[PDB]
């Protein structure tokens, strides 16, 4: 038939355009950039609604989505980002009063039944401000988290040479809080990858690439692990 | 202003209301009057289903 032949010709031209967008869709790894207004989320990768930034590492494409301009309630749009490669939750470690709201935000992002399958990259940003605000002594993190007065730097710590011990204590205390949440629930199904960042850190693209690689690697070993 | 909530709620109080028995009769009669015309309620055969054919 004369028209249905042009119909099938169009259908196959569409299928062979969809295959070309399929290749791009599978090469482009996608990420959800979460974090409060104080988080330096836009400053992580140096290069009226959702904001999409794109970057590459080792020819792997990453799209990263900042869900700006939403009415303060993640639950009914985070279901869109079910089975993205990773969430990127950025916390301003220096805003100790905001830090509890960010910690409850992380708790919600971790326990939410749509994201239990997929992992949270956690950039504890503003580490320069964290250092300065500890070393100023002017605001006692002990006041906001009295358990800090009984926390000592873990043996697995690897500070940069020349950070004061109480700066490392603050760093790793905050990290241990997010790891407390990450360990209390979900710890088999998905993982938290804590990292420490400044807005000057030009390596965060590499960090995201390395953690996405690790996530996808574990997601494949989940198939080949025995017993 | 927030009073417009009370304005809406009292406007909803003033809306016309019909007994549940008559709304039931309305739905039940619509179901009867259209059971013929509803291929999912009772199949139309492959002679007329454009999907089976």
């Amino acid at each position: 038939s004369a028209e249905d032949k042009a119909a099938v010709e169009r259908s196959k031209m569409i299928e062979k355009q969809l295959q070309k967008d399929k290749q791009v869709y599978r090469a482009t790894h996608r990420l959800l950039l979460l974090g409060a207004d104080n988080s330096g989320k836009s400053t992580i990768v140096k290069q009226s609604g959702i904001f999409e930034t794109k970057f590459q590492v080792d020819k792997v494409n990453f799209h990263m989505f900042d869900v700006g301009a939403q009415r303060d309630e993640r639950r009914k749009w985070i279901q869109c980002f079910n089975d993205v490669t990773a969430i990127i939750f950025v916390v301003d470690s220096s805003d100790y009063n905001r830090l509890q709201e960010a910690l409850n935000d992380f708790k919600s992002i971790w326990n939410n039944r749509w994201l239990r399958t997929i992992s949270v990259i956690l950039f504890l940003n503003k580490q320069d401000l964290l250092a300065e605000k500890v070393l100023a002594g002017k605001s006692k993190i002990e006041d906001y988290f009295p358990e800090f007065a009984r926390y000592t730097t873990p043996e697995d710590a690897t500070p940069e040479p020349g950070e004061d011990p109480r700066v490392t204590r603050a760093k790793y205390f905050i990290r241990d809080e997010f790891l407390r949440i990450s360990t209390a629930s979900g710890d088999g199904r998905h993982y938290c990858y804590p990292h420490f960042t400044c807005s000057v850190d030009t390596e965060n693209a590499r960090r995201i690439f390395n953690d996405c690689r690790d996530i996808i690697q574990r997601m494949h070993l989940r198939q080949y692990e025995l017993l | 202003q927030a009073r417009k909530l009370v304005e809406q709620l009292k406007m909803e109080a003033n809306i016309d209301r019909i007994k549940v028995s008559k709304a039931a009769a309305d739905l039940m009669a619509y179901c009867e009057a259209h059971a013929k015309e509803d291929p999912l309620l009772t199949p139309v055969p492959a002679s007329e289903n454009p999907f089976r054919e």
């Binding site: 697995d156 996808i216 494949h220 070993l221 989940r222 692990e225 025995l226 | -």
Partner: protein
């Protein structure tokens, strides 16, 4: 001879275990369409290959070797030997495919998704099957049921592959040894060795920086090495025997005829039992379907 009783026993046991194992794998992978992942699609292709290898090769090798005569006809000789060579070809190329999937998945994890969806799996399966059916076409053409007679004055027959020039028969077995053992073996060594390097580099980096995840990885490395070692133990005997029979024919036949080749082939078919164990019954995400299926 005392050997027939142990031959019959070990064949019957491996045949039963291979039929049960591969049919259980098949039924679990077809009853649970949620389980028909790309990898599991290759495992289904392998399990079918290994079932076909069991059902064709084991009877029509054990029975002729016990009876020292090919009781069946030239058509059965051609048909069996075709399906044998085919299911060897497919089984080996499926092991290669699973090695290259696991290499993509673990050693190039982010790029892997671009080039292993279900469409690539089915295209590669069809390619390996159709290629195997093509390159095994010499078996039905040139296999012949060459007659002889045993000292009881029984008339008897043996199913034997006699490509016309002996020099072409040597070319053929060198080609099959290369394409269907040495290259597959090199590729599996490369794939599982790079995967093992990747995983151990991860372990040593964590020991520099979960313990259950380190155990899961050492368990995977062990299972991968068990795959490589049992592939070489299964197939190097048969293919060396065939290469010897190609080059120094009478010297090989004089020593390996009967019991030795019967157990060499029993190893080659033991591969068909080993493979569904390691690739299915050891996997968690398959055990969790076997208990869910009928």
């Amino acid at each position: 001879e005392w050997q027939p009783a142990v031959q019959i026993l070990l064949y019957s046991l491996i045949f039963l275990l291979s039929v049960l194992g591969n049919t259980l794998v098949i039924t679990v992978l077809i009853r649970n369409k949620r389980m028909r992942t790309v990898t599991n699609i290759f495992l289904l292709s392998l399990a079918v290959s290994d079932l076909m290898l069991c059902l064709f090769c084991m009877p029509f090798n054990l029975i002729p070797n016990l009876l020292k005569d090919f009781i069946f006809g030239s058509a059965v000789c051609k048909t069996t030997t075709y399906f044998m060579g085919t299911s060897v070809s497919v089984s080996t190329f499926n092991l290669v495919a699973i090695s290259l999937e696991r290499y993509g998945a673990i050693c190039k994890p982010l790029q892997s998704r671009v080039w292993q969806t279900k469409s690539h799996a089915l295209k590669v399966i069809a390619a390996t099957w159709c290629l195997s059916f093509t390159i095994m076409t010499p078996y039905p053409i040139y296999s012949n049921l060459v007659p002889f007679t045993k000292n009881n004055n029984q008339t008897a027959n043996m199913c034997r592959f006699l490509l016309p020039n002996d020099v072409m028969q040597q070319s053929w077995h060198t080609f099959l040894l290369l394409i269907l053992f040495l290259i597959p073996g090199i590729v599996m060594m490369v794939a599982y060795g790079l995967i093992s390097l990747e995983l151990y580099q991860g372990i040593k980096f964590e020991a520099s920086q979960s313990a259950a995840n380190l155990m899961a990885k050492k368990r995977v490395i062990r299972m991968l090495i068990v795959i490589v070692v049992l592939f070489f133990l299964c197939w190097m005997p048969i293919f060396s025997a065939n290469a010897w029979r190609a080059y120094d024919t009478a010297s090989a036949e004089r020593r390996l005829s009967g019991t030795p080749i019967s157990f060499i082939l029993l190893l080659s078919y033991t591969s068909s039992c080993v493979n569904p164990i390691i690739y299915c019954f050891m996997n968690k995400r398959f055990r969790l379907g076997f208990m869910a299926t009928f």
